[PDB]
Design a protein around this ligand. Sequence first.
Ligand code: HEM
Ligand code: HEM
Ligand code: HEM
Ligand code: HEM
Lengths: 146, 146, 141, 141
Amino acid sequence: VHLTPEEKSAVTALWGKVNVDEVGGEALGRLLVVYPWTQRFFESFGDLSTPDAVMGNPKVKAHGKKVLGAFSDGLAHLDNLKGTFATLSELHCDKLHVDPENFRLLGNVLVCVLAHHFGKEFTPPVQAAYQKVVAGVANALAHKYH
Amino acid sequence: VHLTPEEKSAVTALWGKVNVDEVGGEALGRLLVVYPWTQRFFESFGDLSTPDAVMGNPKVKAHGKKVLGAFSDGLAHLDNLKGTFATLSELHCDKLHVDPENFRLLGNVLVCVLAHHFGKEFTPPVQAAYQKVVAGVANALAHKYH
Amino acid sequence: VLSPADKTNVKAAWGKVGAHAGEYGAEALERMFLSFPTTKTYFPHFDLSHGSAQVKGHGKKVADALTNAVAHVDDMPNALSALSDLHAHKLRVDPVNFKLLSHCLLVTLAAHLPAEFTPAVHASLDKFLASVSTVLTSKYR
Amino acid sequence: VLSPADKTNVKAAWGKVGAHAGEYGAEALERMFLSFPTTKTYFPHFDLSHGSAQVKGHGKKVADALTNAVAHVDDMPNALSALSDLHAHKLRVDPVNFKLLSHCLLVTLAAHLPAEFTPAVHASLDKFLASVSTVLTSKYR
Ligand code: HEM
Ligand code: HEM
Ligand code: HEM
Ligand code: HEM
């Protein structure tokens, strides 16, 4: 986005240390748990009755990996999140009917998961750069809504 | 701001009918009355203790006219709000220390004021155009914050 | 909290809405769909065309609920319990959308009650819709 | 509404913070200032540089107030009456900002209490900060 060279590098370097598999399953699960209303799109996933049930759900786990996968790829197009997510933006609007506010919630959950994982390494300035990315991605995903 | 030409014509047509002096005073007064926390910036304005004290305060009326004056100019540069509002953005940030959320509250209040004044003439689609405009101005005013 | 003053203001302004509540409810929805398109994600099953019977029908429902909250201004949490449960457990509308509808409700009233829509009434009506929104979102988690 | 599990979760997590609450208070502010620069508009009289004594001192104050709130989790409105007054009538911070500090506090806790920051605890702390926010902005109008 309006990422600084130094900001671009910090994002880039932390991400290189991320296990998308684990972080994706954790981010989505935490979302379903912290903000229970988000479960409205995943009725077909099964048992989301408890934190334990959400966190253990493999459908949740596999969806999280798909989402973070797409997010991951977007980090390669930080200069055109808009064009990178145009088709996904249309899909989310036109087929999935997902309120873009959900993109924002996930973003913040993602930031908590990174802090959780990297502790010390996730410094205030590194958080600042990720907040910009997360906001940039949410905006890009919401861009084609009409 | 992404305003279809037909949105731009609609904005411009109505604005032709507005008495900026009067609307400015009404919009600013209502802001201070509906969101009293916004009064934090005007302790030198005197008595803002009741709705009548606010609405009739000669200082609120004069300031309102100044604010809407700047806004009307913004309406002739819908193309370049960021540029138009850059020095004002800097001032609000660096000198006045005004949280940008204030700009969004004023925009919403202004929309109610236009609805109040134009009645049926402020159609659903005219409101949609003005919502885009007010958001663009708030955004332009917050662009230089740091 | 709503003060005695707020309560008087709301009963008075809503009093004037009278028989038009339904039509105003529908208009508020249309304004919301046009100004905040993201709210449409909740009505994928509706015909959102101008003059949709579904929108008309839905507008009445919303308006009836507000009318009911005014009638029970001293016991809103109980008067709206059912609606609070529905929104929390079935509809699961994200909280931010309540502020969007409230805003379009205020625009609609402003457009129709010029004489009653005073600064004081505007303030009371805003606080009221905020309170209704809070009740409807109270059982979310 | 904090459930009994929530209150427990909160008391547990906060229990672990202990002597570091002031440092965490300070770290959460620093994260807020950097991530959401608009929040700095409320502290024009502070030195917002890294490790400023004003920020440190302020972090302590906030942490202390949180502690007191956990301690009176059952009686928040009352334990925080003075702070609700201060914020509503003097400080007049726009309500949107409370969500930003709350988020920065979660991030700070996450970063320092890895074993304790489970999904259920995360849920509880969020609800807790939301409740604290509600109390602090309840007398605004
Ligand atoms: C970082 C933001 C997000 C990204 C990059 C993203 C990306 C994706 C991708 C790549 C798919 C695959 C489907 C396909 O290509 O047909 C998908 C599907 C989906 N996403 Fe999103 N997503 C995001 C956020 C969300 C959020 C926050 C929600 C709701 C809470 C959501 C709900 C869904 C649903 C319901 C599906 C369909 C899955 C299925 O068919 O089982 N997404 N998303
Ligand atoms: C449409 C959005 C706005 C525009 C176009 C605008 C424009 C202006 C202008 C032209 C001035 C005078 C500049 C100068 O003194 O050199 C001003 C001053 C000021 N504005 Fe803004 N303004 C807007 C919104 C707001 C809001 C919402 C607030 C607070 C709630 C605010 C707070 C102030 C204050 C406190 C001053 C200085 C008043 C004084 O002289 O003591 N403004 N604004
Ligand atoms: C203060 C504001 C609100 C009030 C008074 C209200 C009231 C109602 C009522 C009375 C119903 C009908 C339930 C029944 O069948 O008995 C309903 C349904 C519904 N509401 Fe809410 N609501 C509010 C806010 C919202 C918002 C902001 C949204 C989304 C933007 C929303 C989305 C829905 C949906 C999707 C339905 C189901 C419609 C259908 O399938 O027929 N509501 N609401
Ligand atoms: C989690 C919610 C919050 C809590 C518990 C809290 C608590 C406090 C406390 C304990 C004080 C010091 C009171 C005294 O001096 O006796 C204070 C002051 C203050 N707070 Fe709040 N606060 C919160 C949220 C916020 C937010 C979000 C902002 C603005 C972004 C803010 C802005 C201020 C300011 C500007 C002061 C005065 C600082 C000074 O001049 O020393 N507060 N707060």
